[PDB]
């Protein structure tokens, strides 16, 4: 039987959680994790000290910052007390936190910018702010470069605009493809 | 996940002086651990280096016959013993982790001070 | 041991300007490292492998080099970045560390 897939996320390169599904096993194992990077310093394989554990057995681990390397090969391996190494690109895995302190800004009568602050690097994220109405149930979506300024040219005073933006590591220093949480909605 | 280090030390010269590094956060023996001392307003100076799962040491040739390093896995504590103190020994004693790329983690540092 | 020369022994520049820090090796080393010494702290990496940033650091470092030649970039100075800066090689035993590079502020 083949052993769970490694999830690993990188929360704003701040910890790293990595997670199995342990109960498609048969037989409740507490499976172990070593990770390493490729063309390290290190030729010894770094053991899991932060587990984590769910239903009585272990579910992932957390690594902090110190041990997160954007830009090198991440090689994780689920052991079984059968092996199952993972070669992963922590910068396509980066999950950012989501932007706070959102504020509409009425520069004109028709113009609304929304503004985000952000807990990372601007530069490294794309934002995607989605705006709903009253009657535009369907949340329109557009996405915005690292300058964090959404600029409406077209908005109506009557309608109740509610805005709500998530982040992307992506695409000028990596290439993660899961977008970060969706912010607090604020209303207009 | 630090190294934490002993106190400072008063040391009269001709004597021995052992720095201890405790690692939490991670296994000691799953790292190189590494001396290093720095002179006061002088520049870093490596003293030597050891495999906390081999227990094998390499010593700076300096101090490659005064210089003893080894390691509790058990305690995951390490230890430098420098003998023959001199008044030149007067420095902060670092210990520095190597888990991933260079020396990942320092400890504080600890202060000898060696005079009659 | 490869003894490690880093100029100059003091930098005085203002914050916001580029500096950079050279380390010559008396014989060619595969990679060079970096560490950054706050007055009264323990020495704390920045660049290793001669290009890459360690954890958390700023994206103005930068560094580069190649045998014996390596240089440290900083492309903005910051009020946090005047510290004593050191190279250090792995490539021949025993590591060697440079004497430093004290970034000062020039008024």
């Known amino acids: 039987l083949p052993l769970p897939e490694v999830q690993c996320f990188v929360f704003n390169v701040e910890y790293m959680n990595c997670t199995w599904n342990s109960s498609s096993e048969p037989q409740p194992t507490n499976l172990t994790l070593h990770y390493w990077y490729k063309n390290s310093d290190n030729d010894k394989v770094q053991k899991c000290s932060h587990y984590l554990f769910s239903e009585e057995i272990t579910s992932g681990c957390q690594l902090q910052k110190k041990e997160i390397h954007l830009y090198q090969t991440f090689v994780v391996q689920l052991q079984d007390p059968r092996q199952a190494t993972q070669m992963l690109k922590l910068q396509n895995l980066v999950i950012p936190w989501a932007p706070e302190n959102l504020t509409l800004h009425k520069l004109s009568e028709s113009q609304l910018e929304l503004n985000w602050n952000n807990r990372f690097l601007n530069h490294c994220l794309e934002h995607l702010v989605q705006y709903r109405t009253d009657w535009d149930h369907s949340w329109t979506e557009q996405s915005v470069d690292y300058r964090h300024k959404f600029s409406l040219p077209s908005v109506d005073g009557q309608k109740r605009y509610t805005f709500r933006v998530r982040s992307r590591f992506n695409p000028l220093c990596g290439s993660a493809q899961h977008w970060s949480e969706w912010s607090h909605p604020i209303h207009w | 996940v630090q190294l934490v280090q002993s106190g400072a030390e008063v040391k009269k010269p001709g004597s021995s002086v052992k720095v201890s590094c405790k690692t939490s956060?991670?296994?000691?023996?799953?790292?190189?651990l590494h001396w290093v001392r720095q002179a006061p307003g002088q520049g870093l100076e490596w003293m030597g280096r050891?495999?906390?799962?081999?227990?094998?040491?390499n010593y700076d040739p300096k101090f490659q016959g005064r210089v003893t390093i080894t390691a509790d896995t058990s305690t995951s504590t390490a230890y430098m013993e420098l003998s023959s103190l001199r008044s030149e020994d007067t420095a902060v004693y670092y210990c520095?982790?190597?888990?991933?790329?260079?020396?990942?983690?320092w400890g504080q540092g600890t202060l000898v001070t060696v005079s009659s | 041991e490869i003894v490690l020369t880093q100029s100059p022994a003091t930098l005085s520049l203002s914050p916001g300007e580029r500096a950079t820090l050279s380390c010559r090796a008396t014989?060619?080393?595969?990679?060079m490292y970096w560490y950054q010494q706050k007055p009264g702290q323990a020495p704390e990496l920045l660049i290793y492998?001669?290009?890459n940033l360690a954890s958390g650091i700023p994206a103005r470092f930068s560094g580069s080099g190649s045998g014996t030649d390596y240089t440290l970039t900083i492309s903005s100075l910051e009020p946090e970045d005047f510290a004593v800066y050191y190279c250090?090689?792995?490539?021949?035993?025993?590591?060697?560390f440079g004497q430093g590079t004290k970034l000062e502020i020039k008024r």
């Open positions: 520095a982790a190597l888990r991933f790329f260079g020396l990942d983690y």
């Open positions: 956060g991670f296994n000691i023996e799953d790292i190189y």
């Open positions: 050891i495999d906390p799962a081999n227990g094998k040491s």
């Open positions: 014989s060619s080393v595969s990679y």
């Open positions: 492998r001669t290009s």
């Open positions: 250090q090689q792995w490539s021949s035993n025993p590591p060697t």
